[PDB]
């Protein structure tokens, strides 16, 4: 019964918000990532890193406000407050993009803290730790996208900035420069997310329409008791229904709920891998066979060659404002354009 | 061709900046999240019916009348992961929430 | 625009191409075409497919 | 010397086989275009 | 089309090797029960 054990006691008390040992990492870091994002979006500009306004103070609304990435010139600098870039000056630190590293790193340690909490609470309660395991998928996306991707690039400048329209911009960048929609790892992600949403909706709907009549009321919610031993819907009728509508159905509730874990988690992991490739401009940009034929045969046209024309438009039209440090000057006559437009 | 359609749609309609598309993403991302959540929570709270050398799935037999996981145990873990009252203890309300969130998000993105 | 596998597409790039802007919203069944060759050039299959699919 | 006591039989039920084949066939269908390039 | 020749053998094997593996485990499961 020493101090360590006394603190364990106190951390693990059953209270409205459980603390745990993981709370020591989670809570400060989660609160600081979120404070940094609300602080930056309210007050802080992107003028010096990006030539953009990005805060409510400047006239931005909820969609356009962002905590923007540091200037490309900062490389992959940690941009510590006390570091040689900002030399302790909090004002300069904001103006140089320090809040982006602040948010990203405190955010990274918070996700760790959060998944530690999932492990901690599951051990204390005596459940298997599959919810923690599932949470590995959001971690993978976060690190690959916000950390790995810009680390393979020239700077943090090219990571996503923390904001609604700034993320939209990130999406469009990845189409035009990486042709990310063509990437089978994104496609596997798409099918995991869409497959997830489908499973979510189809499983909720099935339970609600194979219910057992357990209460007298038109409102079927009242007739469930959290401690009842009985399944509250018929798996048998659900199974016959889906077998006759769709041909196959689930017959094993355990497989079903595992598959629900499996689909979206795997989807996310696959997309993380592909972003890791893009860290290196290692893209699924082209099909070589298509380019060779099309170079030689100017009547050959597919949706594949149509979409690269659009990526070419995107790059040339957005690059100068989206990468100001490159001092891209594209005179009117070099801009790719179709007829009339 | 799909990608072509969605790139042109964005040029001509700025769909990313359209609230109904944003609700679609909310409905699709949330759908995937809650699929994972519900799957991981039911999976987390399976009742030991098997040995380490067999699939846990064999702990459920088709049409058995007892439930095959402990929802109070799942509630107790998830309520403590967040706080008590952000966690479901009624399986009907939970599965209706599961159904409604993606359905409505996609209604909206279809309406977008 | 070439959409099919035998015309130089793969699974990722192939498509049944939408019907001609020249047709607009006009109904274009096979029997409104002079011939299948015309119907294929102007993208008749798309309409046949989407109308049957949406009904079905 | 005794025969090893740690040995165990392996199982793959029919549903798992249908699922695994579908996974592989669909994976092949997705990547084949990239393999040919 | 000027397509990578090894795509064929790669697709074939990518398909055949994991499938044969599955079949092997299935048929020997059925012969137990």
């Amino acid at each position: 019964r020493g101090w360590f054990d006394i603190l364990d006691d106190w951390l693990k008390r059953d209270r409205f918000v459980f603390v745990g040992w993981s709370g020591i990492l989670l809570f400060p870091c989660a609160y600081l990532a979120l404070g940094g994002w609300l602080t930056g979006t309210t007050f802080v500009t992107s003028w010096y890193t990006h030539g953009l306004a990005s805060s409510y103070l400047e006239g931005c609304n909820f969609l356009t406000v962002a905590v923007s990435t540091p200037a490309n010139s900062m490389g992959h600098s940690l941009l510590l407050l006390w570091g040689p870039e900002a030399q302790g000056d909090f004002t300069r630190w904001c103006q140089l993009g320090g809040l982006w590293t602040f948010i990203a790193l405190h955010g990274a340690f918070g996700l760790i803290g959060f998944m530690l909490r999932q492990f901690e609470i599951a051990r204390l309660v005596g459940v298997r730790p599959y919810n923690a395991i599932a949470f590995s998928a959001p971690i993978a996306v976060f690190v690959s996208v916000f950390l790995i991707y810009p680390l393979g690039q020239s700077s943090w400048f090219f990571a996503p900035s923390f904001g609604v329209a700034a993320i939209f911009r990130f999406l469009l960048f990845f189409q035009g420069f990486h042709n990310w929609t063509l990437n089978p790892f994104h496609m596997m992600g798409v099918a995991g997310v869409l497959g997830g949403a489908l499973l979510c909706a189809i499983h909720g709907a099935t339970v609600e329409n194979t219910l057992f009549q357990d209460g007298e009321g038109a409102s079927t919610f009242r007739a469930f008791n959290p401690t009842q031993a009985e399944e509250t819907y018929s798996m048998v009728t659900a199974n016959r229904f889906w077998s006759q509508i769709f041909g196959i159905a689930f017959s094993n509730k355990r497989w079903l709920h595992f598959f629900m874990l499996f689909v979206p988690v795997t989807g996310l992991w696959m997309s993380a891998i592909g972003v890791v490739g893009l860290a290196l401009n290692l893209r699924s940009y082209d099909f070589i066979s298509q380019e060779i034929r099309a170079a030689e045969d100017p009547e050959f046209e597919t949706f594949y060659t149509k979409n690269l024309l659009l990526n070419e438009g995107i790059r040339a039209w957005m690059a100068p404002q989206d990468q100001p440090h490159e001092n891209f000057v594209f005179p009117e006559e070099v801009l790719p354009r179709g007829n009339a437009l | 061709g799909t990608f072509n359609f969605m790139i042109v749609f964005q040029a001509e309609h700025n769909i990313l900046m359209h609230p109904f598309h944003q609700l679609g993403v909310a409905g699709v991302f949330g759908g995937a999240l809650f699929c994972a959540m519900h799957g991981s929570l039911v999976t987390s709270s399976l009742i030991r019916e098997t040995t380490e050398t067999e699939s846990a799935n064999y702990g459920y037999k088709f049409g058995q009348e007892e439930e095959t996981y402990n929802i109070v145990a799942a509630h107790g873990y998830f309520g403590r992961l967040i706080f008590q009252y952000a966690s479901f203890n009624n399986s009907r309300s939970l599965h209706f929430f599961l159904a409604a969130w993606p359905v409505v998000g996609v209604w909206f993105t279809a309406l977008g | 625009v070439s959409g099919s596998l035998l015309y130089g597409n793969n699974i990722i790039t192939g498509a049944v191409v939408p019907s001609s802007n020249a047709i607009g919203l006009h109904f274009y069944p096979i029997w409104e075409a002079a011939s299948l060759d015309e119907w294929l050039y102007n993208g008749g299959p798309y309409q046949l497919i989407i109308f049957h699919f949406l009904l079905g | 010397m005794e025969p090893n006591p740690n040995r165990q039989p392996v199982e793959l039920n029919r549903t798992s086989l249908y699922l695994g084949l579908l996974l592989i066939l669909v994976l092949a269908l997705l990547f084949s275009s990239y393999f040919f390039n | 089309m000027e397509v990578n020749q090894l795509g064929l053998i790669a697709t074939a094997l990518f398909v055949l090797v994991p499938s044969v593996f599955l079949i092997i485990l299935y048929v020997q499961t059925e012969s137990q029960q």
Binding site: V236, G247 | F62 | - | N13, A28, S33 | -
Partner: peptide
Amino acid sequence: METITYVFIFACIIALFFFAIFFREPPRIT
């Protein structure tokens, strides 16, 4: 040759579908 490969794989999936539906382990109650 690529055409053949694509259509072959697709055909296998359709056949798999056939077996998965009409030749499933039939579900048996309790």
